[PDB]
Amino acid sequence: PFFPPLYLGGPEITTENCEREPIHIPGSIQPHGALLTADGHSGEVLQMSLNAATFLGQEPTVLRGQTLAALLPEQWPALQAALPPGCPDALQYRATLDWPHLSLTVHRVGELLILEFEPTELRNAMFALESAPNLRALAEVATQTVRELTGFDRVMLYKFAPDATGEVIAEARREGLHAFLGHRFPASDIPAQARALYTRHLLRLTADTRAAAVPLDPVLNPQTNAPTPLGGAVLRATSPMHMQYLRNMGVGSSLSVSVVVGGQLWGLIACHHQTPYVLPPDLRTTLEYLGRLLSLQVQVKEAL
Ligand SMILES: *C/C=C1/C(=C/c2[nH]c(/C=C3[NH+]=C(/C=C4\NC(=O)C(C=C)=C4C)C(C)=C\3CCC(=O)O)c(CCC(=O)O)c2C)NC(=O)[C@H]1C
């Protein structure tokens, strides 16, 4: 069972109890975007990240209490129609706004809407994946294609063994970087609660491995007096234990995509950049689609 989070009197995480970190409810986000939560009926703004002013151009005490009908009068009616009560937490409403461009992503958890604001601004990929004659070739073409699309310094295909140890089975990397190909890593480097979360939510990232997390205020959802679930928010703050691991490897930006085969976490497409780096929201949607394509192709090939 999970420890309480830091804001409910829980301990700082050490290597003795990695697996008990409640990574899904950090109560904070990464600073390259802004997050609001709102009531799914009234559109009343219930929580905001403390940096929301410098993104949305209003005072911090002024935003709390207002409704989305006032703030987003064009989007509010379509948002309600798109995410009605009872819909699953995987469904996403997406829009592009002009601002004094911002990408808006919304999902629903229970009676709460979660709004993510970020600045914004493939045919041949599909047939490259289908053409591969064996599993190795598919792995190599997948990492090389993802690197061409994104510009990341390193793209790995990271495969889980039955005992949850991992191995880099294919790799595309920048000239001068040393190889991780064939190296194996202990199960605890990606602990059990992360592996479970990564089976339901297929993409996550750390844009800057040195940036401090920005709190949500208030930290608890006023509907429930309980933590806000952020498992489905890409702006979710990353575990400080993983951030340190990345800094010690010399990585400034990290992103991975889940490869899910037969409902099981088969591997990750895992990406590194040496400097901080924000991938555009449109291009993340493409990566997500490639992960599903790769999952189907990996399934049929493992028969042979
Ligand atoms: C005691 C805590 C430990 C710990 C926790 C932890 N790790 C993650 C997430 C990831 N770890 C990854 C491991 C690797 N990346 C690599 O490049 C290599 C080697 C080539 C390894 C072994 C990966 C890929 C992830 C996923 C995220 C990403 O793509 O960057 C988490 C979950 C983080 C989050 O989602 O908030 C946690 C809690 N890792 C340890 O090593 C010990 C100290």
Swiss-Prot record:
Effect upon mutating M241A: Binds PCB (in vitro), but difference spectrum is altered
Domain of life: Bacteria
Post-translational modification comment from the UniProt entry: Contains one covalently linked tetrapyrrole chromophore. Lacks the cysteine conserved in plant phytochromes (at the position of Met-241) that binds chromophore. An engineered sequence used for X-ray crystallography forms a thioether link to biliverdin through Cys-18. The natural sequence can bind phycocyanobilin and phytochromobilin in vitro, but the identity of the natural chromophore is unknown.
PAS domain mapped to chain residues: 20-88
Domain (GAF): residue spans on this chain: 134-298
Annotated effect of mutating C271A: Binds PCB (in vitro), but has aberrant spectral properties
Binding-site residues for a tetrapyrrole, renumbered to this chain: C18
Effect noted on mutating H242A: 100-fold reduction of chromophore-binding activity
Similarity-based family: In the N-terminal section; belongs to the phytochrome family.
Biological role: Photoreceptor which exists in two forms that are reversibly interconvertible by light: the R form that absorbs maximally in the red region of the spectrum and the FR form that absorbs maximally in the far-red region. Also has a slight blue shift for the far-red maximum. Could also absorb green light. May participate in regulating pigment synthesis like the carotenoid deinoxanthin which could protect the bacterium from intense visible light.
Name of the protein described by the UniProt record: Bacteriophytochrome
Lineage of the organism: Bacteria, Thermotogati, Deinococcota, Deinococci, Deinococcales
Gene: bphP
Shown residues within the full chain: 7 to 321 of 755
